[PDB]
Ligand binder design. Sequence first.
Ligand SMILES: [Fe+3]
Ligand SMILES: [Fe+3]
Ligand SMILES: [Fe+3]
Ligand SMILES: [Fe+3]
Lengths: 172, 172, 172, 172
Amino acid sequence: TSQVRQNYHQDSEAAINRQINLELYASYVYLSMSYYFDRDDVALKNFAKYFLHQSHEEREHAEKLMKLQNQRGGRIFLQDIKKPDCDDWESGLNAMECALHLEKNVNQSLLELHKLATFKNDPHLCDFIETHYLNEQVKAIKELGDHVTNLRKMGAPESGLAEYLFDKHTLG
Amino acid sequence: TSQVRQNYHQDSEAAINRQINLELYASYVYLSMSYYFDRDDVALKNFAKYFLHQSHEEREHAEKLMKLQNQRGGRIFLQDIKKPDCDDWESGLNAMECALHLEKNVNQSLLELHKLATFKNDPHLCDFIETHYLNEQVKAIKELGDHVTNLRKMGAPESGLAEYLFDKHTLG
Amino acid sequence: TSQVRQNYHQDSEAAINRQINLELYASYVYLSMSYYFDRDDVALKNFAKYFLHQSHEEREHAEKLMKLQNQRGGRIFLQDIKKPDCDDWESGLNAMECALHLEKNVNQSLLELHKLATFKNDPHLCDFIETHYLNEQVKAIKELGDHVTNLRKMGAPESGLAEYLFDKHTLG
Amino acid sequence: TSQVRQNYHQDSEAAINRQINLELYASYVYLSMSYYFDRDDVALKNFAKYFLHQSHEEREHAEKLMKLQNQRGGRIFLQDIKKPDCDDWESGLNAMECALHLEKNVNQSLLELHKLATFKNDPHLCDFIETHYLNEQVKAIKELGDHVTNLRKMGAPESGLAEYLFDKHTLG
Ligand SMILES: [Fe+3]
Ligand SMILES: [Fe+3]
Ligand SMILES: [Fe+3]
Ligand SMILES: [Fe+3]
């Protein structure tokens, strides 16, 4: 056992390793979405910037969790990162809704991790999660809500002008 | 009786207290409107900016009359700040129209003060209303009229595109 | 129902709405205190500055709570802001004593609000209160108790010198 | 008759000359008060600089009215500047209460002058009094009232320590 390990239950260790996988998965979904909007037949390059930047942020989330795992004396076990559920994301509003849906899954997973950490009386782990993940799930979910709503009210996905104007004025 | 009081009728002091409660109420309406446009199913960030600024500006008006109450030797007596009429403001256009109605009422009230203070031969009080309040109201009314007109022409409130663009290109 | 709402209970949404009102009321109490010390027969700029600053901070607390409500997908419902209890706050010491009382009641509301968030397993809400509200109350309470201590030891409210010199040296 | 007179009554010219004389008198009262506090047996150096400042402001008020008299085409007529009622002003608190009484008398004089300008329908002479003299009198009376109030609670005039600290912290 690790000379640093203190108050770090192996269920919390197991859960952090599968949160690490979900954060890498999330980053890969976003990578897929970003380069979808790069396509010459979609061509929304602020949608592409937006999802690429969320792709990088979600990789920082993974490494933070991996750093946490070593800080606490657990051992990273990496898993396959599954390909995203869709090669084709259909529209800007559809990707935004898929992202909002992904972000709610990721957040549900973080709420479970926190419930477990709470059950395991790991206040450093709870604080770690509250400090670095919980509010930025709320913030990202709220921001995608904002985005989904404006896109709908602008007349997406049926309107091509809606996704264009949103791309320049909200995402530029 | 106040050692500074001079030519300050008890009727003007009571009227000043009433206007203070109007200005606080106006502040509260605008606060209400602002965080409506911050909802995830309205999501108009600069409509929300605009009204929150108005709310702070109204709070300045209230405080300036309380300064005046004291400068003249009157005594401040505050009342309840009633909640605004609506919790839901329907749309950007309807909010602007409500705000336009509220400004004309506040103007009505200030013109009544001025009239009273004329009746009571209070030339310093008449100049105070004129210098700090009356032309602020003509400006605010003329602005909300400008906004109300533009949103109507753009096709608000049926057209979600209209309010989206107005928020970016006028309230931004 | 709201597309961003996740793990946000009805009960917690109601409390936030009540806390918004309490913060608004405390902003109003401090404003009443501010212009009491602006009076010609009271005359203490620094008590009045101190309290106006607190009125404005409390206004900021109330707005961050409305930002949260929207962030989490709940709905703000504003109510009347009650007038404060006193019109004459008697003395600088007595205002400091009532301000201390107000801050402890607001803390009681925040502690109860945090406890409900625990009960509903809202770890994000819990973190929100800890970060922005709980230590603010503990500092605000300690500062106010320090002020009452010095005002009493100086001879207040009997001594007009006591309060005059505190106004210059502590609040300057 | 002056090539520049228009809507300027014989009575208004005469009341301006009366007001010039009053401002010169008030400057002369403050100068007397100034060097009372410069005496080796009063020795309140900031009371003296305060009242020399007031004395010089009053000299500027008189000059502004002489400039107005010539702006409207009326003719300046100077009278004796009577000596102040007092050579000995007894105490700083006493000098302030007397100053308060002076600025209320000069105010009542300016209110009667604005009433006359109204009587004669001189909107320029009215606004001149409003812009330049009315709010200054309201502020001078309030500030003196504040000083009188603080001196009293501090224990003036029986407390020489009070007048000394007042001179340091308020007036220095
Ligand atoms: Fe994440
Ligand atoms: Fe106003
Ligand atoms: Fe607070
Ligand atoms: Fe003067």
